[PDB]
Amino acid sequence: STLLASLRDWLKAQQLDAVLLSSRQNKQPHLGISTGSGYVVISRESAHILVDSRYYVEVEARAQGYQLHLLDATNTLTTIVNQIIADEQLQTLGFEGQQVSWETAHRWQSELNAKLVSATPDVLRQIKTPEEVEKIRLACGIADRGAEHIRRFIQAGMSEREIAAELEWFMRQQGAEKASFDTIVASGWRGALPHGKASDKIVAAGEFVTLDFGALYQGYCSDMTRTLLVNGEGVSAESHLLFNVYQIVLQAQLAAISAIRPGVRCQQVDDAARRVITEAGYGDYFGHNTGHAIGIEVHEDPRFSPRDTTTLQPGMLLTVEPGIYLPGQGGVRIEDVVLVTPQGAEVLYAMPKTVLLTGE
Amino acid sequence: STLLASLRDWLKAQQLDAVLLSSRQNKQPHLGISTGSGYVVISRESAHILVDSRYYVEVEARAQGYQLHLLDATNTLTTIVNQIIADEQLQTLGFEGQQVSWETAHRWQSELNAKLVSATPDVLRQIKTPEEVEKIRLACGIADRGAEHIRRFIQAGMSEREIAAELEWFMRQQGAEKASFDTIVASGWRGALPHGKASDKIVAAGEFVTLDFGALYQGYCSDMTRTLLVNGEGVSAESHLLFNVYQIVLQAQLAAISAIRPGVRCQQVDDAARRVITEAGYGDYFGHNTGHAIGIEVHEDPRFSPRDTTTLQPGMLLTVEPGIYLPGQGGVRIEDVVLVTPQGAEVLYAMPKTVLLTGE
Ligand SMILES: C[As](C)(=O)[O-]
Ligand SMILES: C[As](C)(=O)[O-]
Ligand code: NA
Ligand SMILES: [Zn+2]
Ligand SMILES: [Zn+2]
Ligand SMILES: [Zn+2]
Ligand SMILES: [Zn+2]
Numbered sequence: 001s002t003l004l005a006s007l008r009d010w011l012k013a014q015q016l017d018a019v020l021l022s023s024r025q026n027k028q029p030h031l032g033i034s035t036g037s038g039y040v041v042i043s044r045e046s047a048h049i050l051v052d053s054r055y056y057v058e059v060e061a062r063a064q065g066y067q068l069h070l071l072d073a074t075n076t077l078t079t080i081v082n083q084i085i086a087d088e089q090l091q092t093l094g095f096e097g098q099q100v101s102w103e104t105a106h107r108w109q110s111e112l113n114a115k116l117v118s119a120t121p122d123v124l125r126q127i128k129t130p131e132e133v134e135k136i137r138l139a140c141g142i143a144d145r146g147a148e149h150i151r152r153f154i155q156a157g158m159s160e161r162e163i164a165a166e167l168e169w170f171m172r173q174q175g176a177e178k179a180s181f182d183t184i185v186a187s188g189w190r191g192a193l194p195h196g197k198a199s200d201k202i203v204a205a206g207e208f209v210t211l212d213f214g215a216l217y218q219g220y221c222s223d224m225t226r227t228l229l230v231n232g233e234g235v236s237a238e239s240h241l242l243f244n245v246y247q248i249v250l251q252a253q254l255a256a257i258s259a260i261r262p263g264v265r266c267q268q269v270d271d272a273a274r275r276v277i278t279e280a281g282y283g284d285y286f287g288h289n290t291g292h293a294i295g296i297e298v299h300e301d302p303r304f305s306p307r308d309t310t311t312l313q314p315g316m317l318l319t320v321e322p323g324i325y326l327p328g329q330g331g332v333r334i335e336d337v338v339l340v341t342p343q344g345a346e347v348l349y350a351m352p353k354t355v356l357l358t359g360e
Numbered sequence: 361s362t363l364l365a366s367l368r369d370w371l372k373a374q375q376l377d378a379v380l381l382s383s384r385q386n387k388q389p390h391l392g393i394s395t396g397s398g399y400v401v402i403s404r405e406s407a408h409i410l411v412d413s414r415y416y417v418e419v420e421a422r423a424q425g426y427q428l429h430l431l432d433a434t435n436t437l438t439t440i441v442n443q444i445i446a447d448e449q450l451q452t453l454g455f456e457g458q459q460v461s462w463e464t465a466h467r468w469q470s471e472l473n474a475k476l477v478s479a480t481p482d483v484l485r486q487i488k489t490p491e492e493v494e495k496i497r498l499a500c501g502i503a504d505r506g507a508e509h510i511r512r513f514i515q516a517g518m519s520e521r522e523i524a525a526e527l528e529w530f531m532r533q534q535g536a537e538k539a540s541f542d543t544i545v546a547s548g549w550r551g552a553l554p555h556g557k558a559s560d561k562i563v564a565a566g567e568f569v570t571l572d573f574g575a576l577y578q579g580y581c582s583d584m585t586r587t588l589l590v591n592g593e594g595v596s597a598e599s600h601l602l603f604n605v606y607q608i609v610l611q612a613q614l615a616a617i618s619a620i621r622p623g624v625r626c627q628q629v630d631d632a633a634r635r636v637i638t639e640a641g642y643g644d645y646f647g648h649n650t651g652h653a654i655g656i657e658v659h660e661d662p663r664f665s666p667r668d669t670t671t672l673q674p675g676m677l678l679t680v681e682p683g684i685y686l687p688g689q690g691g692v693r694i695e696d697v698v699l700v701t702p703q704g705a706e707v708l709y710a711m712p713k714t715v716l717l718t719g720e
Binding site for chain 1: 466
């Protein structure tokens, strides 16, 4: 209803009669599941769901408000959509040109009785509805508890991968469908790798270990990073080589978060965090964006980047995750998911972002 | 290398001067890793790898036989490939039209100084090399032990989500990188959902519970289904509501395996399973294919489906997974990964497929 109204408004604004939704992320709200298979066709007057025998009985429960079509040998996308084009005399038909393969679009371009136009409805997902925000909250909540669990769990001698397995297992136990992306556990020198997926490297005492991870909860994602200190005998934060670097990052993260409220454009938030790191003399060791939107996918638009001029509004959720990465020494990243509120910004993680020790 | 020769034989047969490989699965044999980023360019005369700083040092070391190019701001897909097109006067360039989006292929066709032709090298992967067969053989092993473990682990009272967490965790602990796909755990009435991903539903005594799951091991996939009987007081197989249905499924599964040997068309294997299920009076509740090939991906070609006329060859690996799904009652599926052998067929799982009780 609200989902369908929002889509139809988009159709009119875009000069389109209907849209063929094929991407899993844009099909999920309608299907109640995330699948590569199946299609959703939305017209100004009707709503259709197309699935094969593998998903029919499962979708059928949730699919109130939709016309339900079985995909089989005789009944295909072509036969079904063409029937729909006929009944409502549809002239123009949208498709996700960034999600559909050249081959599939090309067959469509020849087989579909309408003018096919590459359009993307991804922009509608920028502002979340309360039901979505709530789902993301529990995703974020599941993540938040995982951080604490994994902090008590970590022992010098363990592998980065074991830590990830344990962390994911715990998230799963907390109701997660799975991790929202391949878990990053980057200890010691691997901390210099912003994308250091958990490896067989042994975690050692006195090392920083960066955990970047997240939960998929009912089709919505969380995304968190904490850089912890692997505890051992005579280990202290202030003695660490990268202690100042840690603080510079934590500060840059706060500087970006305090800069978030409705109305502020995205590039200014990156400017906030980046200038702190840059005037600290580490501008060249901050190679990625300050953050990214999040929702049905881990990475959505807009971006906290130097070039993104998108203006901020309540209902948006974005990550704030600056970092400094020093090849040969290690690195630090600290990430929060931030919900934009009418008043300002709201952090959905309770986990402290100071230097914490593992174990005990 | 045989890999490059086989590709070059394919190039010749396809009448293409070169191919641009972009999909993670078709790059993996060349890169030794699985990434969305990066490209592999093979001509009749040369072999190239294009990766960014994240993978360059590790790939450049291992990737002997290739010309290595760094991807950065200055050196891009366009600048690098166009140089190669120039140096060897390439006329035609194949690209994976089923993996590259409509938008991306359009951009490439204009930015690249050659005629791009949608071609797909996926067929070279149908027959596995002894190295590949072994890796899959071991991937299957991890799943096989996981099934044995999870069967003893399951107790009435657990949720499907909980059972999945343990099964996934155990696979990791057994050396798996991760699950090859989202784990299906469908107990009682949810057993009527062929893709019923593990939910919060409690598994109850006397329920059938279907576990469909798999491991990603060394870049290759396993895929297994077992339907177990949840143990409880006075619970017995023969008394179960779906016992006959279970037996019909098991029978159809064996009949399909028995049909597998070099020379047989894939549709004939499907015919074997479907005829058993159909003659039993349950054809209308067996809506999906009998199986699929598996390798770098969980789903590959050919398919054990009514229409696939592909003839079986030694070194191919396919699943055999017929099922019967009864809305309101439950369902049964039994899945093996089967290696086509020189003489006939070999099942790579040791787990029994008769009705097994959980626990103890
Ligand atoms: C590793 As990320 C950009 O999903 O926080
Ligand atoms: C659930 As399957 C088609 O990957 O066995
Ligand atoms: Na061209
Ligand atoms: Zn993250
Ligand atoms: Zn992030
Ligand atoms: Zn399968
Ligand atoms: Zn399966």
